[model samples]
Target chain A: LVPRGSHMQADILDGKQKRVNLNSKRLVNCNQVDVNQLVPIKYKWAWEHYLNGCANNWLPTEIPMGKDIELWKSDRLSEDERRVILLNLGFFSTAESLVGNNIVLAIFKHVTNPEARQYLLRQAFEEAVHTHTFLYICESLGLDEKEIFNAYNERAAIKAKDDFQMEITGKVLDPNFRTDSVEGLQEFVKNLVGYYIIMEGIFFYSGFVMILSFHRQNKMIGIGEQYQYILRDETIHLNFGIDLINGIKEENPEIWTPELQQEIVELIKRAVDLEIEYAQDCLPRGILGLRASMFIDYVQHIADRRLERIGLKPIYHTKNPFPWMSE
Target chain B: SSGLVPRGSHMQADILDGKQKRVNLNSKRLVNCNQVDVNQLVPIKYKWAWEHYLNGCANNWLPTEIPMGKDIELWKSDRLSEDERRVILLNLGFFSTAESLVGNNIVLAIFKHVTNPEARQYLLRQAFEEAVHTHTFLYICESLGLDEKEIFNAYNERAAIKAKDDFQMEITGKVLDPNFRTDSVEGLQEFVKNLVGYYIIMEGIFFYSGFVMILSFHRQNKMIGIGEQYQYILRDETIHLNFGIDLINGIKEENPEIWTPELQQEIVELIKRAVDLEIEYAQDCLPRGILGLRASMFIDYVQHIADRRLERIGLKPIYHTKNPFPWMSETIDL
Candidate 1:
């Protein structure tokens, strides 16, 4: 047995030392914490989530893009349909990296539970795979690097969505921000609502709907299938995030006041507005029976589902406008 | 482009550091403006990194796939010597925790410092493989029904066991230092020292000796379960060692001035220290003869392993360059 008190002491002569208290929930930075001992896992479900993520391992290159290339050359798609695809390819090419950066640099630094950290690292790898998948889609279509890559700047709605996320995550990136403090935990929750709820849940699904709609109509089927895989990955991420946020609330009950709940609701509302604007610009001209107005409704409907998932009252009672999207 | 005129037409803007007037995409900062230039993988000086990443992708194997049935019977047998059983428990104690150290170093210490995307990719893969290695130990321990606390705490109880752990901690601590910078010559030396501690010493030489010890039992047709697991592990470590050597060589190529005479001497001393501790530990594990192996033979094997590791890094050998057990090659032919 490990000597109870001796495990905490530094053997100054041999220079063996323990950096942080293994039992402490707070002040345990991910960078320099205990990794050797995994038992007494504070969060058993987090370990299970990690194993699930590992079991769902996939590589972007494994998916065939032959039909995607063929679809890109066909005249079945309108200028608006093709343009939205380009914008998404550009937005995700950088946006996925943004989420990945937050995981590694911001969240990983604060969440000290080794099992939880394992799931976080798995999410980071999936984010990288998502980034690579976008590249695969872009290259398969032979999309122009200048227009598709610079869409974040060239497109107004995409720019607004990205800027909103950066603003929320920017506070967490402050080197002085400590997760152990009450204020820091508040900021951390804001980051969670911003990225997981707004960016991924509301924003990403809007784009997925636009792409998958083409698949429903038997157009751009390959890219649509790719989105199917990505949507599945995103769903797992969303569940993990909700569980994590709920766990944090349970641990620090005083931090999640009615005021913070209101803030999260407002944040989701703003995301819906931004996504509607994106859908408008994406389908300025109705193509293949998909109009800008329908996407706006879809965004609100999806946003309500997300709000309900997080135990918030929905502001918009919009129902699923496109039933085929469930396919 | 939002009517935002390009500051530099050719340069890519970094999205992470928006405060900067212009974030140079070409810069080598670890967390540069959060930009990944997927368009071009140019200035491909780190070709070995990409190769290692692909190799890692191909070498993925879950530990659950390897059966541990034979090992259980061997552990229950009375024919096993006390020294052999002690060595097995001690080795398990060291490695069960040791693999996490290597994985944590890659993610928290090393990957955060290396700026190249391809290098980062390879490091991430290495970290995952380290996780697999840790699980391998867990599977063995569970199958053998060893007391978990006893096996985990053996490293702390024995001084010989703590020596190697302390040596690696000393190397990894520098890179993890918040004030440690990689651009400076001193910082680069710390990085090199970290690589040598992990890739060369822990993996290349130390694991070789441990592999020889464990595989020796399999040579006598005992404990084939653990031996097969070690074979797969040895295959993975071989790739990791190769990748690390290339990384060390690449760092030297980039910062020529850091490879000073004193730095070379420092590296040689580090290897010598590692060799000394390993021999001492080997003696502790096999104080008496077991399956045609004794302390002296283990010491000679340590020296043999260290000599080759040193020569691999373009350094002169410190001992006679001959395999003490020539038949080890045949035993490990997986």
Candidate 2:
């Protein structure tokens, strides 16, 4: 059954023979859909976004890493820069899979709308792509399997970011956590903020600034390009999440109190702190031409933008210090 | 934790020591692998999962790449008979909905229970491909300008079609129940049944029969473009079927207690029941024959497919075998 009395047409509220109105306001759970009947897509934006993702089709192996390997073997990198690369690879290698796991396990199970599910599937696949991209980087550089995968455990910052995300998402993974209740809706929105706002939008931007800085400096350009590609994919993911969260907010207006928005803002601020700490450890003595403090400033700046994108006021008045990082 | 792997125990922190920490095997669980040592796959026995995942990646394709303009023309022409057209619409309708069923089962039912990360990776790919298949059918429907409700609702509107759809739902519905478990012998049996219900019966058997019908039209040069799309889909299905067979075989091998003689018999009967239902539906679909196709031959082909599917999962064949339609292999490499 669909939740009704929304902006959707009330006339087509009852029938198996009726077509899926693209404009319907009914929240179709993933389980309720007539799968073959995904016509007249109500959420054309989601479907179009999915098609766009499919068009951006790429293979991790398609990009050559010969030059990156050369950089790793040569002395063009500082110890901190190399460590940062490893940390990025290590955290992302498994973290990407975590995002994907949440999608199929939690989000996909609840977001009953077919077109929305379509984009979510696209997002899930891109998460896979992000995972594979890390694997590609790891295999390319011939990094020790232990060092890259275990970076999360050996490093506190990586573990903290993961633990923060896990804490937010863990409750939703409970088999009993129904998505139809008010509590369930709040938990689901927390998940959206945890992943889309914190993980993709805020947390990853610091890593992008670090890696893409290497490209800006003409070092490890191959892996830098890989991060660029991944960043491009994450941009889409972030935008999709914002759209989904806004749509959910619109549909379930009761869930988004000023207090909840404030809570999310605080959540983003907390994630920014984790990134700042992680970035501090990543570039303790400044790598190549970048400083740890600069990276922290960049994290704050990006976090504010993410908060604003999700309809929250900026928590910090920081400006983009590394303008080329956006390029 | 249902005797499954715990989330973070495998990759527990050696934060101070800075050495590669040894995995604590006692606390592992499958569903949440947050702390599972992903350096290499923890349960190495699932090498098949990584292999299939790579194969799925290698086989990525987009639906729009295949042109359906010719199919658009075919639908408008008088070259197709009424029965032939009806069968085409029925199949397009059935699969458009059915692939979604399989995809949902993978994500919601199977993926939740199967805790292997490598296996989950492959399952994610399989789910995406199922979405791709659904899109292909939608593309065909749009190309033909058929009323969306007519084709989509046909599964519920028509008796024979609804029978097949409901049978699959009946098989898969239980595993998706909130109380379903995967740790006990009974739970594992349900999981295996879900596997056979989906991979073998739905995708492997039923889809192949539909493929035979559609390709037969292509063999007669009727809807060549749609047939080409079927070929691409068939290639993906072949991998899907093999991946599923491997999954079923792996579960039997790993949890030997779950694969009792009685369970084997149950699986055999399940396949037989599916075979009978498919044959009956074949009869209904081809009651008024067209394009030189008959109901009995479709029944034989269903048996032919079921037999091969059974053999793949280590069961005895039910039908005395020969290619009922020898030209199928020649038309497209299966």
Candidate 3:
């Protein structure tokens, strides 16, 4: 006999008359309908997010990479300029997929609501699209496939950030991992904040600030345009993820204790530090109009913004000095 | 912690490395292969999955887009006879829960097991389509003003329906086991068996009888709107069927040892049992003839369809029955 659980279906043919009531349905937990029935949706915001995501279904192949191709070949760009471009590509090359893998293999497994799962499916596919965008960027620029992508193993900053994200991902990858208990659900929330808030909301946004700053100077404008499109998609991801995390906190109020809150603040703080390290690596020397100091401040600023979005106070009171308004 | 990771030769860190090795086309598999990068969708060893993924996205339609205005009037009107009503309700009841069963199996059982990136890409699209089909039934139920509880509960409430569902569930049960994988001969056998039960039997064989019955009404120009949705569902499941069969065959070709004679015979026997179960539902779906459709017609058509399905997966046909209603073939333009 199959064991009883929320994420797995015990039996569809048991003739036990298990009705999936909408009232008790939630993002993760309870033995409600795990049958992938998307109707009778309780979370209307999730369905709206799903619709919103589909309306802007952009593909990477359609975007013209002709200019960026020509621009990378010219000596008008400095060595520092190329370093920043490839560094972001190195982080993004696997990170888009890492965030995606968690969604497909980890987050999608535990988040059991049909409506939210419908959106989870959207977000996971978009992760693939974003990952494809990175590949497209690399292929179009004729960058060294080995040198750019495998930088994670060679570079400490990239590996450290990936290591942090993967460790959290490895927790949910546990075959016995479940969100049906207090500590268990807290672990799940840590994953949500780890990837959603810390990883995408802060770390990914920090990369955007650095890469898109080149757009302001028209240096790598074509690549910058792609980054802007990616930024739009990622903003949706962050907003949707925050809403999903907030919904889980509201549903399981006991798991979001003051201790857990402090843990999350610490989590964001750690992520900001790791991101600042990455920014410093991407900008060991300044490129065009950007500096390592500028990115260092931006990381904590974005981190604070992410923390506040999920009902936490801004830890770092640093002000934004990057090119957010221009791009 | 060890159990959380995959049972491959490569570690999770290997995925982040781009210079691992040339991803030999022959090294890719439906599951548990360390050779191919699960993150990279390009350099695809399996072109069929990627092709099917694009095809699935090419014609994406929501349930709301297909207006049920005509279905709404016909549902509440006396235009439908008692027999026709039962047929509609029976098809609705069976499919109402059946789509979710398939979706749940895809996301929980199969998608979790499959390892190839292109194959996983198509699985995501297919799982999303499964959700859409489930949504379609809800729209059908609501648009028709049918009682949601009664319609959705048919999986457990009706014996004929439960038999067909339980038949497929038998295979998914092994798949639902967290410890289950395709790393061993027995594990691979279980995985292929799961594929055959899901793709060939449930989505392929069991769902078709209902399609023929419902589409028969559409051929007569009744319940045309609901039939249109069924038309799309039919197209979607066809790709899913072909994709899954490709998955099974590709796995079998890659791991020939698992497709033993014993397993082959077992697959034939499973299809036979699935046909009998479908016949039982066809009987319940149409005890007497409804419109131009007969219960016995599908009983033969089930064997006919079963033979076609068996042949598709490299199995010998058990029954040599021909298509009773050739009209059913052209119901949905794929």
Candidate 4:
């Protein structure tokens, strides 16, 4: 049996060195206390989330892209189908990049908790893989890396969505930005809501349904295989992000106002609108049981759940058109 | 204060300017800003950083990959001496929190300022590795059935452990200042102090004594599970140390004015202080001296380490102590 109160294994009830009260740990605003212990984790779910994040670790090159390349090389795909594939490859290619930049640049620094940042690091890794996944697909299919990534510039819909996220998170880049005041903390929450609720939770789903629909018909199964993997990973990211945003809210209750709730609901509504425009642009003419309106309902459907998770009222009570999706 | 903005560095306006200049790749730097879009991971400058990032990813490891039957059984069997147990438990306690401290600096302090994409790529990987390293102790503590409170608080309760943590914390404390930024010589110096404290002293100096202490078990074929993990941890830390050295050296090269003579002497003195603390820690972990390991020998080993670390940063070695363990050179040679 392990001995108690021994030299290295002290079991003293109390001593000169008082144990750091785990309750003292907050999501943000540790007043920059800078305690870096991962154990004695106050946020147990954060560590679990990190472990789950690590467990889902799959490399992009490990997945065979042979059939994906072949499908791209063939003429079996319709112009609309090709457009759907390229559009997702375009949006998600750099969209993954944007999420990662946000994690490292915007979010992780303000998240003072070691365990939370631990999960943030895990999410950052997966974000890179998702980034790499799209690049691998593009390279495997002999697509233009530059044109696909730069779609945010030329494609007005993609540009608008990208612009929306950029505007919300731009405050983080300012050297003057501080998370001390009411507006400051609210802005940080806005950063979380913009990326977590609006971008990852709401915007990415319509593309998932569009791409996975190809897999539903057994076309582009390789791309579908990767997308499903990415989607599984994104779902983890979504839950973790929501948990994080909520954690911040619960810890700093002063920051979450009824106005903030309404703002998030409306912010997500704007995201839904932007995603619908992107859906329409990606599918100007819907093909094979997929329509832009279905996606609009789908985006609204996901946005409802997304908002509801964060304690906001749902705007759209619409049902998911794609029965295949859990939404 | 918003913090100082160093000369020749683009300020916050460039990021919000809505137009990323066609970046001259050569203009990419370790700390000071270039107006390039951070999302662009190409047109590479600092291929060394990208190379390290590649190596970092290619060589990813998990502690669970190593089985712990022998270690858990050995640790529980009451077969080991007090010195051996002290070594294991104290090393775990130090590393348990030390790894998180390193990761915190990488994420909260270093990565925020090192605006180079290739370098940030590696910082992300290193932070992940730090998390993995932190989890290694958790796995070890769990498998060994060691009291985690005991292990995690060793840094707090033990003078040696606290001193080593305090050494690095002194820098991180500065970086944690609400107004901290890498926008001035003092600010940049504080960060470099952070870099040197963690990479050179924390990972580079303080770790070796514990490494040598623990690896003796592996050498004896005794706690192979924990031992193997330490080996992998050393590999990961070697990359972190080298990458940090390059980052420090690059920043020094880029901003020639930052590494003043006074700064160099102060860094040497800091290492000198670290060496002194490690000696005290060696005695604390091995008061009775197990496995032919004398605390005095660790003094030699740590001083030798301090010298090599100082020379790596182009500073004069204070203690020209001969390497007590020549085999340590080969442990993390890559």
Candidate 5:
């Protein structure tokens, strides 16, 4: 009776649909939609400014306290501890921001009523504000806000001259979306959904244990506060995406096929691999606690989690690359 | 026009025809003489700090009267009367729901960009307490065997409750018309604020008066149930009233430059008018309306209470008259 205007089914709105167990073997019937169809129209300037702020300035990985670096250089810590600390920050930041963005955009896309739209806009603002809070934590840790905010250029910068180094660098780093045409729009949206749904689900969580590792040592309490709020908001955001995907699938069963789901899985795999590769080269040399194997294992574990969130069977046969990451 | 203005400035001033006042509409009203430039923005966080200040008052001062079983019984006697019981419950329920939403939203808004740790902690704790007050209503409804949802839905559906005499509307309407919000936004806001002041603060003071009725009933060995409940709510209201004073004092301190002589004049008129309306409402709701408790007497008592509220907030009291309801202090336990 109190403004019952939206698609607020008691089942979903009351949190009846929250999936508790994430078993790779147990598949639920979830449908996938083309990402372009899910992009919201009239993305408000405020929302975009907030989004840009989160990606550019907020991510937890944007800052390193030099605590890890100092300890490693002094041979005071092991390699696994170091990688677990830094690399996990990288994966966590990417996944948290992407998931929140995707969920808000999805909700905004489907709800057509203006009152509901206004309310959701406030909801969107809340999400963006949360991202700002995340960035504040990073900024507090001595991170250059400019570097983190501008780092989007690695994947998003325009091309320089045609020199060999430029060519190699340009080839390695291009923005997620190069063109604004319809086809390019489709590709960009699809890539986002794939990374958001699959990679964030599987990959980001794979690194949660490493955070737990940091927490166990009583280090990074501020960062923990940042992540805890992020986690609470992300849980809500994740459901918004999953619910939209399910609703779309229920409406148009023909559009989402098993074949489409596989295609998405492959796209996410490529992106995850690219992210891991980029991270390895960019990280400092001879960090005491991190290694190449653990990083790859973390990725595989994440990929598996991602596939399961979308109700798809995992393709990778590797046992969760790092069992300790589960903690 | 009456209090601290210098006589010479207006002596030779010419009155413009068709204009009652010489106030400039475009003036910034408050300005600083210092010319030092500031790079950092003051931020919206200050506005939020004010909201939390209100929350702290609400959380810390008011006793929640959700379950009024004892209150309902104490209210049933011939000394207390049925009309009074109905009025209190309905007003209490509606006010609680409104405060719940306002308090929680204030906290949520304050948590973001509220850079100062002290500001954040106070607001967050107050928000949590507001949640407790909200649930207290649910507990009340549960004990009464009434559907909480039905009660809330009815409150929402009804026309916005109007004060019996509507002095709040008259004052603000005469001063400034309603804005983009539903009819009389400024008036509506003042109504709610005054309701918090009058219904919450004055109601607590008036409890001193209610205790006279209670002592009269106790003299004849009558009901004490509702009196007990009122005492609980009174306990909360004392804190709430003190908080209202603190909140208003904080505001006066923050922007004293803005609280010009003219603004004080308008608020004084507003409070005076509100006291008259409240007296009218009390007559309609109270039992027998008392032999000596005529509408004029209630008005005088209310105005005195209003003066006390202002004085507590560091404002000079305009009403020089002393307290009229002396028996109230004797009846109410300090």
Candidate 6:
């Protein structure tokens, strides 16, 4: 629970894309915004993509698509679907690498908890390994590493899903990135929460589900091994990510704001839908088990699990008929 | 600016200023430009000399008997009598590790600060070569089943601080605490001075002393031709060392207080203490060798060589003597 000024106003409603009445002037009286308490207001689906970027320490590699990609051999994918897959995968590889280095730099900045810091360091190292291995893969495929690294800097120019748009925050673009102050630090925490819980846990899993489809059918085994290693490392990384989330909750109760909760939850739903859009646009032919409805249903299911893990009551418990779809 | 001069003095002052400027300018022209200075340029006709240097810089990829080319093959040496090889490999590992760290840092630091485009490009390429050398050094250790982590830990842990302290404590005595307050500007100068001294004298003349024994080991079919490869590496390092010396001298010309008597004495003492530590470590660490090199003799010879190095830099010698291991000198091809 966080104490707030009487002048503080809630800027968003709970339901997806539901607008709340707000006088923009009422938010003006607040002099200092404590990041630890500055809750997120507007939750965008694209946040899932952005948060997922953070979870992988921001380096995500692209995988190929086509008739040779088994599931597509049976049914032709729309060009939109193919383009979406190419862009999303490419974004994943590039963002993760940049974020991966930044996570280490960030950890070296703020976290004082020794055990938590060590876990985060391990997470950082894992990200580095992921980026290195992925870069090699991308290079073998004839993609330039420098070009991939610089993609996020030109985030505005790149047409990504809404989630990608959500991630390119004004703070990140600012030169003097101050994590020392409360407001700046809040944004940092909010970004991490979005990255680890929503992005890695939900979005990465969804993407993996797609990549795994290719693997189960014996396509791109060499490439699959690389993904498997990245997955294996990420799971270990998520253990720390989970610890960090839990540690943040218990250690700094003052920083948690209701707005933050709403922001993340909304971001989760947006991520789900955006990823679905990403999936549909990228793989219309459908990788074996990745039906559009099934993928969409899993989004709600994954968000519920994440909510429970982070000490929040399950927000959307729509009965997912495809319970064992992932299994 | 000329208004400060007396009204009647402009013409006279201009004439006087021109004469003064000429005197200053002529000082540079006093050097005999026509003289054939052999030291100024490398003798192109010296084939072996060039080979020694080039191979040192450009690593010989040639695989020979004993798994040796430039760097000593750890696995080959590991097969020797366990107790003896332990010392050899451990000390060898330490030496190899130091070279890798210093070489890597030097290249990176150069890339960051060195401004001349041509120099920077050449340095960046040299850095790449050094990177390969360091990688090869570490990989060779790994291939031998020697724990690479332990070697890395030894270098990275406590880093320069504890390593120096450990060496000092293990030997005669700890001299100056690095914590002593000195003017930073003066400190920077002294740093450049010592770096110059090390590049030219210590690394250039003295590193070759221990290298002679390694080359001898090669002669005995132990890591054969590996020592041969090091000749090329040594030649390149020598050139790199000269660059350091040259850079330092250039800096000194611009700011000469760096060569004050007090600073010079401090540097000499520091080098003497460092020499003692190296000698002590060698005697204790490498007590036996299959190559028939005695540890005690090597220490004295190394100390004498250290003095020769110091003298070459125009610094007073701490242990002034010619090569104590004169036979060892003739034994090496370089």
Top-TM-score candidate index: 2
**DockQ of all models, two decimals each:** 0.19, 0.28, 0.20, 0.27, 0.03, 0.01
List chain B TM-scores, each candidate.
0.86, 0.88, 0.92, 0.91, 0.51, 0.61
What is the fnat value (0 to 1) for candidate 4?
Answer: 0.24
Which scores greater on TM-score, model 2 or model 4? 2
The alpha-carbon deviation from the true structure for residue A167 of candidate 3, after best TM-score superposition, in angstroms, is 1.9
**CA-RMSD of model 6:** 22.1
Best model per lDDT: 4
True lDDT of residue B165, candidate 3: 81
Query: Which portions of model 4 show Cα errors greater than 4 Å?
Result: A3-16, A30-34, A73-80, A170-183, A216-222, A250-255, A287-289, B1-24, B183-186, B257-262, B316-318, B329-334
List model 5 lDDT by residue over B1-334, tens digit each.
1123222211111212312212222221111212211111112234444354334433332223333556444443345434433344444334434434334233322222222322333433343344334444444455444444433332233232234212323432321211212123343334334423433334433433344334334334443433443444444445445544544454356445535666566566666655555555455435354334444555566667777766765567876666766754443541
Indicate the docking level reached by candidate 6. incorrect
lDDT of 6 by residue, A238-317 (tens): 55556556655554565567876677677667766766765564455654545767666766777788787777678777
Docking quality level of the chain pair in candidate 5: incorrect
- What are the clashing pairs of model 1? none
What TM-score, computed on C-alpha atoms, does each candidate reach? 0.84, 0.91, 0.88, 0.88, 0.44, 0.43
Residue A250 in candidate 2, Cα distance off native in Å: 0.7
Would you list the C-alpha lDDT of every candidate in the order shown?
Answer: 0.72, 0.76, 0.77, 0.79, 0.39, 0.45
Root-mean-square deviation of every model = 6.1, 6.7, 7.4, 6.8, 17.9, 22.1
Scored against the true structure, residue A153 in model 2 reaches a CA lDDT of 68
- Cα lDDT of model 4 by residue, A214-313, tens digit: 9889888888888888888888888998898888888788888888877777778788889998899877788997888898788888888887898887
Predicted candidate 3 versus true structure: per-residue lDDT over A114-217, tens digit per residue: 77877777787777667767767767776655455565765778889988887665468788888889998999889988888888888888788777778878
Q: For residue B259, what is the lDDT in candidate 2?
A: 85
> What is the TM-score ranking, best to worst?
2, 4, 3, 1, 5, 6
Interface RMSD of 2: 12.4
lDDT, candidate 4, equals 0.79
